[PDB]
Write an enzyme that holds these catalytic residues in place. Sequence first.
Site, PDB file in Angstrom:
ATOM      1  CG  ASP A  40      58.766  93.371  23.717  1.00 55.72           C
ATOM      2  OD1 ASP A  40      58.173  92.598  23.002  1.00 55.72           O
ATOM      3  OD2 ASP A  40      57.433  93.925  24.275  1.00 55.72           O
ATOM      4  CB  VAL A  81      68.862  84.205  34.271  1.00 54.35           C
ATOM      5  CG1 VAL A  81      68.186  84.463  32.661  1.00 54.35           C
ATOM      6  CG2 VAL A  81      68.975  85.913  35.101  1.00 54.35           C
ATOM      7  CE1 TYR A  85      60.879  91.414  27.123  1.00 53.43           C
ATOM      8  CE2 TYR A  85      62.418  90.892  29.172  1.00 53.43           C
ATOM      9  CZ  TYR A  85      61.546  91.999  28.201  1.00 53.43           C
ATOM     10  OH  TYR A  85      61.643  93.475  28.744  1.00 53.43           O
ATOM     11  N   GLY A  86      60.216  84.902  27.294  1.00 59.67           N
ATOM     12  CA  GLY A  86      60.270  82.978  27.469  1.00 59.67           C
ATOM     13  C   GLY A  86      60.850  82.525  28.101  1.00 59.67           C
ATOM     14  CB  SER A  87      61.415  78.921  28.047  1.00 62.14           C
ATOM     15  OG  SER A  87      62.613  78.196  29.125  1.00 62.14           O
TER      16      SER A  87
HETATM   17  N1  LIG Z   1      62.815  89.166  21.230  1.00 61.92           N
HETATM   18  C1  LIG Z   1      63.452  90.190  22.246  1.00 61.92           C
HETATM   19  O1  LIG Z   1      63.026  91.113  21.517  1.00 61.92           O
HETATM   20  C2  LIG Z   1      63.858  89.747  23.242  1.00 61.92           C
HETATM   21  C3  LIG Z   1      63.939  89.892  24.627  1.00 61.92           C
HETATM   22  C4  LIG Z   1      65.052  89.345  25.652  1.00 61.92           C
HETATM   23  C5  LIG Z   1      66.054  88.208  25.306  1.00 61.92           C
HETATM   24  C6  LIG Z   1      65.699  87.494  24.102  1.00 61.92           C
HETATM   25  C7  LIG Z   1      64.564  88.451  22.866  1.00 61.92           C
HETATM   26  C8  LIG Z   1      65.524  86.412  23.578  1.00 61.92           C
HETATM   27  C9  LIG Z   1      67.336  86.328  25.001  1.00 61.92           C
HETATM   28  C10 LIG Z   1      66.865  86.795  26.056  1.00 61.92           C
HETATM   29  O2  LIG Z   1      65.758  87.878  26.573  1.00 61.92           O
HETATM   30 MG   LIG Z   2      55.089  93.747  24.514  1.00 61.00          MG
END
Ligand SMILES: NC(=O)c1ccc2c(c1)CCCO2
Ligand SMILES: [Mg+2]
Length: 346
Positions: free
Chosen positions: A162, A26, A31-33
């Site tokens: 974030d 998704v 924000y990563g994998s």
């Molecule tokens: N660190 C963050 O602000 C953040 C943002 C979105 C997010 C995650 C962590 C982990 C689950 C996936 O979606």
């Molecule tokens: Mg940022």
Amino acid sequence: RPTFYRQELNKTIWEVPERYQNLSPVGSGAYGSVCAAFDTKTGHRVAVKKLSRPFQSIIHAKRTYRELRLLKHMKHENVIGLLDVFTPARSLEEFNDVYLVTHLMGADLNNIVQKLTDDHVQFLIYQILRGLKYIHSADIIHRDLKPSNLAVNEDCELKILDFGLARHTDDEMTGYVATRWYRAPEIMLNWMHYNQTVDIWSVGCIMAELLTGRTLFPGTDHIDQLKLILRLVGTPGAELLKKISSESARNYIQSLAQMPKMNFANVFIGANPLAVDLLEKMLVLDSDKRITAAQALAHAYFAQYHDPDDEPVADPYDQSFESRDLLIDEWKSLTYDEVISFVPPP
Ligand SMILES: NC(=O)c1ccc2c(c1)CCCO2
Ligand SMILES: [Mg+2]
Ligand SMILES: [Cl-]
Ligand SMILES: [Cl-]
Ligand SMILES: [Cl-]
Ligand SMILES: [Cl-]
């Protein structure tokens, strides 16, 4: 310890507790994998993030610890929170992957910002400021409030995202880019030691754009953007110039012809006069003089939503680790301790 199962997702092998079912990639990777899933224990649709190479270097190991510390602390209706954190490892010696679980948040403020009434602007900005009052009470500075970092559902309920991700690079901030359009001038140009007042400038930019449908300061580069800012709010006076501790930056801004602050009622034509007043109090060049989040919640624009008995503050947040120097394995051990000590919410 739950039973874990394995599945190939996002180019690696994910190993997760049986409670999480129907995994599917998704999002865009911002924000990563990340994979969406159904949590059979809670009934929630969740997002599961698997960190990539969390301990390959000192910078990456400390960043992983930072993200976990921040997410474990945040417990507020208008801020992202942590539903679970897990590792398949049975000991510190085999620990090498971290998974974080949050509520699944489809749409952000871009995806809505639709025909926004003034009542919609009141409710959305109110919720941002309620979350910001909480964040700031813990001495956390967000630094990157922008529409793509604000998740919103079908009932207009909002959460701030974030925390603890990599600092934005010089290239990410170059040119005609949304990642710079919401930044306060003192951080965009490294004028001085900055503080939490940077976030209020960002809220002003967001509020203006909800009211007009247009980016407030869509600069094509740092210099173009500064010129757009100074045309609206005026060139700095002698009091602020003294506070610009960078001699180079102070010298450049004195090369610009002086300009007075504009009439905001003639810029934001037709807007609620109380909205115009609040924008004038957020978009102040000297950060010392901006309204704070706690002060803004009491402004008459929010009279329909303000409740001083339901605007909570945060428990204290110890970030002394930020000035600490440790080895990779020491950051890794601190992170493992925080994984195994996690207690889920009610
Ligand atoms: N660190 C963050 O602000 C953040 C943002 C979105 C997010 C995650 C962590 C982990 C689950 C996936 O979606
Ligand atoms: Mg940022
Ligand atoms: Cl949440
Ligand atoms: Cl592992
Ligand atoms: Cl954005
Ligand atoms: Cl940043």
